[PDB]
Amino acid sequence: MYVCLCQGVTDNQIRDAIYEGCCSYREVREATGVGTQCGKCASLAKQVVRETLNDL
Numbered sequence: 001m002y003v004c005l006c007q008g009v010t011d012n013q014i015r016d017a018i019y020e021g022c023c024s025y026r027e028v029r030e031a032t033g034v035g036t037q038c039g040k041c042a043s044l045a046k047q048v049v050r051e052t053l054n055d056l
């Protein structure tokens with residue numbers, strides 16, 4: 001699904017960024033742009049990031 005329409009970021013792309021080495025929400029945002037435009041998706045993006053980091 002699209003977490004972030006403004007930047008075309010899907011949930012699987014967020015997970016990809018983490019499995020590829022991103023270790024924080026800030027890094028996922030820098031890698032993908034998630035949440036940087038209107039900001040409205042940030043809470044959902046943060047949830048995906050934290051759950052995926054805990055599952056490494």
Ligand code: FES
Nearest residue numbers: 004006038039041
């Ligand atoms: S939906 Fe993600 S920044 Fe607008």
